[PDB]
Design a binder for this molecule. Structure first.
Ligand SMILES: O=P(O)(O)O[C@H]1O[C@H](CO)[C@@H](O)[C@H](O)[C@H]1O
Ligand SMILES: O=P(O)(O)O[C@H]1O[C@H](CO)[C@@H](O)[C@H](O)[C@H]1O
Ligand SMILES: [Mg+2]
Ligand SMILES: [Mg+2]
Lengths: 199, 199
């Protein structure tokens, strides 16, 4: 009985920290890091950029306006590229193992990649570990929208009861739950190893 | 009796991995990562760039020629910015502790930073933990040259016997040893904690 495993990317397959991006912008503009952190809000520009509805340049524009950043696109993108990203090799190992057992393994990420940046979903380690990588920007959809989960289920050909989904965001978990997907909130680095050790 | 502690940066205060840079360049140009790794040599351009003797653009030029990379400066710099860097918080903690004990704490790094990149020596965590950061590009000198160590000793006003130097590079250790500096090869993450626990 082959299963579909859907893994969140950010804070699930990788550790990711945007404080390094703000550090880069602070260093360039001399605007204190704390001031950048205070004005760094997830709002409409994020939701739209993630669904591919506004360009990288428009996304960069909106953030720079909101944060009073006097940056060119190149400077914005350079800072963005500095994002801290560390693989969780224990998760990669599980993904490889699930696949050699014949289970379907996919990634589902709301991505803010730019055309100018090398981003985690493009990392060979991650690309090697998954059958398919579903990205919000390619689909025109984002978690926690019902439609994104439905799109994955249809594309992969799995019913909700044959599907297991890991994500560290409660809204994302709720959105998948509503479709009857078995959804496990990732609380920390122990959640996924514990799940796959303990049965 | 106040001491001078000199800490290497790369692979001593931080973990650093240029494979992520090559990954970025590979992703952009489609040239296989392995081919980039094979042609990524530390040669004259590195030595010169580290001492500030050639520009960022000239450094980028030399590497792109050597590796057959069809990149603009911006693309080169963007890839370079992607370098993996993780703090070793245990080292930062020691640096803060040594200073509150009244000892002198400095960093000594052969840096390949670009004017366009946010680089580890600029990280507030590192800047907060050191009295001074000595960078090869600012000095026109590089480890393992006798002159760079001498410059630090003179600037800080410490004799070699009052100085302790940590670096993971054997040539760097040898170069400091020759001036009578107590020099500890950093073999791994345990070397520095062990040194400061065990007396
Ligand atoms: O962006 P993704 O891969 O959906 O997922 C990530 O987004 C946020 C920003 O990176 C993180 O804080 C979330 O915890 C994580 O799942
Ligand atoms: O460049 P730095 O800070 O002198 O030091 C670093 O240089 C190299 C490249 O990053 C590393 O492999 C060395 O191990 C490290 O000490
Ligand atoms: Mg890319
Ligand atoms: Mg800088």
């Amino acid at each position: 009985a082959k299963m579909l495993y859907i893994f969140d990317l950010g804070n699930v397959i990788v550790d990711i920290d945007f404080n390094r991006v703000l550090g880069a912008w602070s260093d360039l503009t001399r605007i204190p890091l704390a001031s950048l952190k205070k004005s760094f809000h997830m709002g409409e520009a994020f939701h739209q950029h993630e669904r591919g509805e506004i360009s990288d340049e428009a996304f960069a524009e909106a953030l720079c306006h909101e944060m009073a950043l006097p940056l060119s696109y190149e400077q914005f993108s350079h800072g963005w590229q500095a994002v801290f990203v560390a693989l969780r090799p224990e998760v990669i190992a599980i993904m490889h193992k699930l696949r050699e057992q014949g289970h379907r393994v996919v990634v589902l990420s709301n991505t803010n990649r730019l055309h100018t940046t090398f981003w985690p979903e493009e990392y060979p380690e991650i690309r090697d570990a998954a059958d398919h990588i579903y990205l919000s920007q390619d689909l025109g959809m984002r978690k926690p929208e019902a439609r994104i989960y439905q799109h994955v289920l249809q594309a992969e050909g799995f019913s909700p009861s044959d599907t297991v989904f890991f994500d560290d965001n409660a809204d994302n978990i709720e959105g998948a739950n509503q479709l009857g997907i078995t959804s496990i909130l990732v609380k920390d680095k122990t959640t996924i190893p514990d799940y796959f050790a303990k049965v």
